[PDB]
Nucleic acid binder design. Structure first.
Ligand code: MG
Ligand code: MG
Ligand code: MG
Ligand code: MG
Ligand code: MG
Ligand code: MG
Ligand code: MG
Ligand code: MG
Ligand code: MG
Ligand code: MG
Ligand code: MG
Ligand code: MG
Ligand code: MG
Ligand code: MG
Ligand code: MG
Ligand code: MG
Ligand code: MG
Ligand code: MG
Ligand code: MG
Ligand code: MG
Ligand code: MG
Ligand code: MG
Ligand code: MG
Ligand code: MG
Ligand code: MG
Ligand code: MG
Ligand code: MG
Ligand code: MG
Ligand code: MG
Ligand code: MG
Ligand code: MG
Ligand code: MG
Ligand code: MG
Ligand code: MG
Ligand code: MG
Ligand code: MG
Ligand code: MG
Ligand code: MG
Ligand code: MG
Ligand code: MG
Ligand code: MG
Lengths: 14, 190, 95, 103, 97, 140, 26, 148, 166
RNA sequence: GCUAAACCUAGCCCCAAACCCACUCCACCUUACUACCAGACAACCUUAGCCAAACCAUUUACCCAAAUAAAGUAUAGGCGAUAGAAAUUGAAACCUGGCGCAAUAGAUAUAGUACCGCAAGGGAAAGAUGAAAAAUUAUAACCAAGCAUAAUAUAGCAAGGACUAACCCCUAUACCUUCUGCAUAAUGAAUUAACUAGAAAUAACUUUGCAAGGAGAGCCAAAGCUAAGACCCCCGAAACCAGACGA
RNA sequence: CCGAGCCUGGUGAUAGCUGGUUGUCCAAGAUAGAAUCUUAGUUCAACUUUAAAUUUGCCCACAGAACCCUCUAAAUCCCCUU
RNA sequence: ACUGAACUCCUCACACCCAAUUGGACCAAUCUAUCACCCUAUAGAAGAACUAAUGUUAGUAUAAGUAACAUGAAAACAUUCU
RNA sequence: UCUCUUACUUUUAACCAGUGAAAUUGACCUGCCCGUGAAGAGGCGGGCAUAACACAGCAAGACGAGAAGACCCUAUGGAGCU
């Protein structure tokens, strides 16, 4: 199929 | 070890508040393979192999072995000149200063275990003398063990106290089988 | 065989071992050869007699049957009319 | 390895074999504790064999500080000025005797 | 670097305090005490172990049987989960079988 | 944490004290310093036979050069020295050839004379003289 | 914090040794 | 732990599984070996030799009638109230060299034992008791402390 | 955070004897928290190194960089504190002996790429160290001619002796 | 010497005891944080599922009445992996701690804060001088990974043997693993600091004690019984049900 | 990120499948096979690990081990001496 | 003829080079009892050791000062021009 | 579009001023030929080759970077359809 992974955003504290 | 209750308890990877869904896909991203957080390999998880609940180290030795150990401790205290038999534990005025001066003059050591009998039949002078010191202790004839004897350097007993100890230690020899606990009235045993 | 139960925390036994075997106090298990009651018309009388004999087990089999049981099945019973009473004790044993 | 530690040459301090042989060892400062279970060997040594070790060679002076410590040590100074300090922590009398003889 | 620079303060402990100097008192009262009370009754602590050792799972079973009828909800759930895990680890996984 | 590690830096220093003269990150990275020190110690232990063989070959080369400068060869010299009941290893021969040329020239002359006597005895199948400097000494 | 005293004592002795080695007294 | 696989991962079958193969304790048919063992009547043995030994030592006085409580007090036999025990039987192993002359109450006494007891001048009494009576006669002190 | 460079100007020396040299002065000064890169500061320090203070100021006045004026002001205030407090009379009898650069405290920001990913923007900071010594500047090391190489080769060929024997 | 390293207290887990609380005035069931108007309808229900039996369709402690022996006994069970009582002697009121820890440990918590979605929900690091900061002083420095101080100088898994001196002379194919055979061009790795992975029964071995009896009721016994020591990992999937949420 | 969604609980689900499994020394220590909806696993043979009881373990020699038409080799099995 | 190993010999005493596995001896940070307080021993317990698991967290190098990148011009700073 | 490409402008390209990545890294003092090896060697044997250090372009190799291959096979691990 159409394999795709969504990106993950880090918390805004670093 | 028979009076040890370790209250240490650490949570595992299941009792920790957290970890439910799956952080990031395993096949999608190129990060490490993980299924849930709060793991012993992550930061803030539970202990893998640690103390789980209160652990009790309860175990009892045979009565004959304990009686033989008491007799061996008595023999060790008697052979090394660390056993002074008395007739009546009484003091003229009852004070810690006179007590420690007599102990230093009679060459006993830095500690001595004073043992009486029946607990209730103890004079007030020696009680008030020992209630102000730390090395001097007053325990009855029943509360005598092995750790308190080995902790002190010498031992002090009395004629009725030593007679009670002798008969209680010889009662273990030439007896019948337990069958039922000795708390019953029996017939010959009081 | 459930080494630790959920109520008593003890060790459980297998009732099949008790219903199919019989342990003696010496450390031997008495079993029965299979097929001693089925298809007896095509077997020679010698085979029929051989199948109807109390055959003992081996070493690994006895160890397995002992591990599958607890300390209750390894005691000594004193029945009134026990036909296997003479087989409990084993005399004339030289290593 | 040899490429990580310094080296020297084999020579005498002041030609002892030519003229006369002298004792290189001078002082032996022992530190034996008063109470403890880590200086029993040193205590027994000072009790039984230190007199014989002092009378064997008059050119060696033995100092017994008897300082209450935990690790018994020994200081050995030579003519050239080298100071080798070793510890006799939990050692028998024979081991300490062999060590001081080698020193 | 995981080494503390300054030395810690000398933790002095009085070896002749109360429980230290009076340790082992009234121990073994059955032998030389005409047998009135068992020495196991002098142990102070959790009620589900006053004179009983047991294993890791046996202690949890005894706790759920004696005290399990008077605990919390999350604590009881965690105890049940731990008992299930110990059961699955002892009666399914392992060695020497 | 209960009774965890409180003296790990001492082990790191004990490992790194053997890696205080290396080039690159091997003198600082413990993970590589361990392997570097391991290989260094293994090679230092295994190179004893290599050092012995190198010293022996150097002694043989020095003896051969000295024999060629005097006017002989190495195998003939070794044979004549082993056939004259004189046990001298390669080290003393090299030391003499480097420092004491007179005794080495005397040894070369003795070897040449022994070789000539052996050739004469082989061509004559000896009978009577068999070499003046020969005559092995019997030790019972 | 890390509970201990013997390792801390050895580390302090090493620090004193490094101090006396870097700054040699008369 | 050896190499990888079930021997290292810990996921091993239960004790007795031979990997699909029919185990040894299954291919054998059932037989009436332990059909009703929990209901059979068990009796502890008691030889006349040990009885004479107890009488000579003094733990069994031959002046009073001997039953079950006397044997429990003398501690010659161990009568278990459970495990389906209906008393203590009698064994004629100590027939020869047996001089006691004392009445004894045994639940099961053989012919040789009764004869040997009657030779010196003893009385054998065969009686039966329910497990409740066994528990009562074994330890009478807790039965008296009970309150029933 | 450690500060040990600004405290070296307080080391008091005992009074000398009439039979002792003059001993040049040592002036330490540095600034903290400078919005610049450490590589460019080190390049400027390598451009300076051991030269006269006036020549350094002249080279920095015509240096088209951001830290040039910063280093110029640092040298100016250091010379001022030297001639006002460190007991320095001549203003042109100074030379820079040591001049290096360090690294300052850094923060973290975002970069925003062309997708859900991003970068770690680390605010690069640095410092600047300099030391002023009185007296004329020392001349540079002249290159060794063929005579020095010949003498060294002769010494090396004369120092070799017999090896692997006695 | 810059970057940066340690400085204990908010307390955190379980015991024994004790049963613990909920309006100062206003607003809070509609668009909660809204003072004021006409259909009153709204609960009373076998939980399921995973795993195991090498599949799986019967079956699989979880059921909320204090210990133990009986007993893992009779029994139920594709009579098989397993489950499991009852009848019975019995069960001594009152005492304030940690042979647990100190911010990557212990509750996630200074906090259910920021942040993500309309939504249920998920959800993380924080604070170190000091008696006198109303002592803005002069010091206490010294150790990891990254840097200048102090770049390179021919040749070679970075190493060893060595000499008067770094190179120059000789030898020598990184580390753990599925593999007969791996540095192989197979797998993992940039370092430092913290954390992380062998938990346990019947039957066995050794050492005290007693002994035809042992054992603190129950159990075993034709040399036995009690006690102690000794022992059996971690992480990683697609799937199913139940309770709520979205056009 | 729908050939069938997000959250929580069952769940630390299971998985013969992958990887890893922490200080030193010494000694012992290498595999005829059978069964299984099984050869990627498991169980039993054989070998390896400890402390005891018993006495025989190896080449052993004159001799012994039907065959059939056409040949039938190199060898093997029991074997006190040494 | 000679060169030529970890094979043999010279002074020493000899347990100090197999996969999996098994057995025997030491080692250290915590608490507790016993002695010493410039730091160790006798006994009991362990959350008792990391060169590795695309292991979790924080600091920092190579890649790399590499790619991307802003502001129309003059000027009294009141304005003018495309 | 080609034979057969060319004339100019912008983005862009090279240097100066600063913010300043991402993938990736076991360490590199990093040349070639013949031959060998887990079967395609800059680190192994024999030869050839050699003062050191940056900038500006192309891809021949380091079976180079991204996805535990979607193609073939195993799984008493699943799901959809009939
Ligand atoms: Mg959970
Ligand atoms: Mg999972
Ligand atoms: Mg935690
Ligand atoms: Mg593996
Ligand atoms: Mg395998
Ligand atoms: Mg399975
Ligand atoms: Mg089948
Ligand atoms: Mg299943
Ligand atoms: Mg009941
Ligand atoms: Mg925290
Ligand atoms: Mg947290
Ligand atoms: Mg450093
Ligand atoms: Mg070379
Ligand atoms: Mg490893
Ligand atoms: Mg693999
Ligand atoms: Mg292969
Ligand atoms: Mg590789
Ligand atoms: Mg692979
Ligand atoms: Mg890689
Ligand atoms: Mg719409
Ligand atoms: Mg798993
Ligand atoms: Mg398989
Ligand atoms: Mg040789
Ligand atoms: Mg040899
Ligand atoms: Mg071996
Ligand atoms: Mg742990
Ligand atoms: Mg650990
Ligand atoms: Mg580490
Ligand atoms: Mg990667
Ligand atoms: Mg790692
Ligand atoms: Mg580039
Ligand atoms: Mg550009
Ligand atoms: Mg630029
Ligand atoms: Mg190879
Ligand atoms: Mg090639
Ligand atoms: Mg390569
Ligand atoms: Mg794959
Ligand atoms: Mg299969
Ligand atoms: Mg399936
Ligand atoms: Mg299924
Ligand atoms: Mg489905």
């Amino acid at each position: 199929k159409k394999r795709f992974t969504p990106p993950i955003y880090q918390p805004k504290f670093k | 070890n028979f009076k040890r209750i370790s209250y240490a308890k650490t949570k595992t990877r299941a009792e920790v508040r957290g970890g439910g869904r799956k952080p990031w896909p395993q096949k999608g991203t190129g990060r490490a393979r993980h299924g849930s957080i709060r793991s012993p390999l992550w930061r803030g998880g539970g202990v893998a192999h640690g103390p789980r609940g209160p652990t009790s180290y309860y175990y009892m030795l045979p009565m004959k072995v304990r009686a033989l150990g008491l007799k061996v401790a008595l023999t060790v205290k008697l052979a090394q000149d660390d056993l002074h038999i008395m007739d009546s534990l009484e003091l003229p005025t009852g004070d810690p200063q006179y007590l420690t001066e007599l102990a230093h003059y009679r060459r006993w050591g830095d500690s001595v275990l004073l043992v009486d009998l029946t607990h209730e039949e103890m004079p007030q002078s020696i009680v008030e003398a020992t209630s102000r010191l730390k090395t001097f202790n007053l325990i009855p004839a029943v509360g005598l063990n092995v750790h308190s004897m080995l902790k002190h350097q010498t031992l002090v007993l009395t004629l009725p106290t030593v007679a009670f100890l002798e008969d209680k230690l010889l009662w273990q020899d030439s007896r019948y089988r337990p069958l039922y606990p000795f708390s019953l009235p029996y017939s010959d045993f009081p | 065989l459930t080494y630790f139960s959920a109520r008593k925390g003890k060790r459980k036994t297998v009732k099949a071992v008790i219903d199919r075997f019989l342990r003696l106090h010496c450390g031997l298990w008495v079993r029965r050869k299979a097929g001693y009651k089925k298809k007896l018309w095509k077997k020679t009388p010698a085979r029929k007699k051989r199948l109807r004999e109390f055959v003992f087990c081996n070493k690994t089999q006895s160890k397995l049957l002992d591990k599958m049981t607890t300390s209750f099945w390894k005691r000594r019973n004193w029945y009134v009319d026990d036909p296997y009473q003479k087989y409990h004790d084993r005399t004339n044993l030289k290593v | 390895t040899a490429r990580g530690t310094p080296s020297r040459f084999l020579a005498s301090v002041l030609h002892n074999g030519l003229g006369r042989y002298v004792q290189q060892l001078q002082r032996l400062s022992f530190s034996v504790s008063r109470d403890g279970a880590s200086s029993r060997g040193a205590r027994e040594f000072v009790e039984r064999e230190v007199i014989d070790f002092a009378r064997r060679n008059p050119g060696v002076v033995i100092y017994v500080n008897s300082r209450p410590c935990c690790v018994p040590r020994v200081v050995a100074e030579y003519l050239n000025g080298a100071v080798r300090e070793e510890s006799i922590h939990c050692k028998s009398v024979e081991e300490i005797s062999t060590l001081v003889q080698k020193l | 670097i995981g080494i503390r620079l300054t030395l810690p303060p000398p933790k002095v402990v009085d070896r002749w305090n109360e429980k230290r100097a009076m340790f082992g008192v009234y121990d073994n009262i059955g032998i030389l005490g005409n047998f009135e009370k068992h020495p196991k009754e002098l142990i102070r602590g959790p009620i589900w172990l006053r004179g009983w050792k047991g294993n890791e799972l046996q202690r949890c079973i005894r706790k759920r049987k004696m005290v399990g009828s008077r605990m919390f909800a999350d604590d009881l759930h965690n105890l049940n989960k731990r008992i299930r895990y110990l059961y699955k680890h002892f009666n399914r996984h392992g060695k020497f079988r | 944490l209960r009774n965890r590690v409180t003296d790990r830096y001492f082990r790191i220093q004990e490992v790194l004290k053997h890696a205080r003269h290396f080039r690159g990150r091997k003198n600082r990275c413990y993970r590589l310093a361990v392997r570097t020190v391991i290989r260094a110690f293994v090679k230092c232990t295994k190179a004893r036979y290599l050092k012995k063989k190198n010293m022996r070959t150097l002694w043989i080369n020095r003896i051969t050069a000295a024999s060629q400068e005097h006017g002989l060869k190495y195998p003939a010299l070794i044979g004549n020295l082993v056939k004259c009941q004189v046990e001298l290893n390669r080290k003393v021969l090299a030391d003499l050839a480097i420092y004491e040329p007179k005794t080495f020239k005397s040894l070369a002359a003795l070897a040449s004379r022994r070789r000539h006597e052996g050739f004469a005895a082989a061509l004559g199948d000896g009978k009577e003289p068999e070499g003046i400097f020969s005559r092995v000494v019997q030790y019972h | 914090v890390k509970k201990g005293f013997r390792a801390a004592f050895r580390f302090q002795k090493e620090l004193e040794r490094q101090r006396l080695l870097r700054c040699p007294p008369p | 732990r050896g190499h990888k696989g079930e021997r290292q991962r810990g996921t091993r079958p239960r004790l007795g599984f031979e990997g699909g193969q029919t185990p040894f304790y299954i291919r054998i048919p059932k037989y009436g070996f332990n059909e009703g063992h929990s209901f059979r009547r068990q009796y502890k043995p008691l030889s006349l030799n040990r009885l004479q030994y107890l009488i000579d030592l003094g733990r069994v006085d031959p002046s009073q009638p001997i039953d079950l409580t006397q044997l429990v007090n003398g501690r010659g036999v161990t009568i278990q109230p459970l495990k389906r025990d209906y008393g203590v039987q009698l064994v004629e192993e100590g027939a020869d060299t047996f001089t006691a002359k004392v009445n004894i109450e045994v639940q099961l006494a053989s012919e040789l034992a009764i004869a040997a007891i009657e030779k010196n001048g003893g009385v054998v009494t065969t009686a039966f008791y329910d497990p409740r009576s066994l528990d009562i006669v074994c330890k009478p002190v807790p039965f008296f402390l009970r309150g029933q | 955070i450690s500060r040990k460079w600004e405290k070296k100007n307080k080391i008091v020396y005992p009074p000398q004897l009439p039979g002792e040299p003059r001993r040049p002065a040592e002036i330490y000064h540095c600034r903290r928290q400078i919005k610049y890169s450490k590589d460019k500061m080190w390049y400027l320090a390598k451009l300076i190194r051991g030269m006269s203070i006036d020549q350094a100021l002249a080279q920095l006045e015509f240096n088209d960089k951001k830290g040039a004026k910063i280093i110029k002001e640092v040298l100016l205030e250091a010379q001022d504190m030297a001639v006002r407090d460190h007991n320095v009379e001549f203003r042109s009898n100074l030379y820079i002996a040591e001049s290096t650069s360090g690294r300052g405290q850094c923060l973290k920001r975002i970069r925003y790429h062309g997708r859900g990913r991003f970068g770690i923007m680390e605010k690069v900071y640095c410092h600047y160290f300099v030391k002023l010594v009185e007296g004329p500047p020392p001349p540079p090391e002249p290159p060794k001619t063929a005579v020095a190489h010949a003498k060294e080769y002769i010494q090396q060929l004369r120092s070799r002796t017999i090896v692997h024997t006695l």
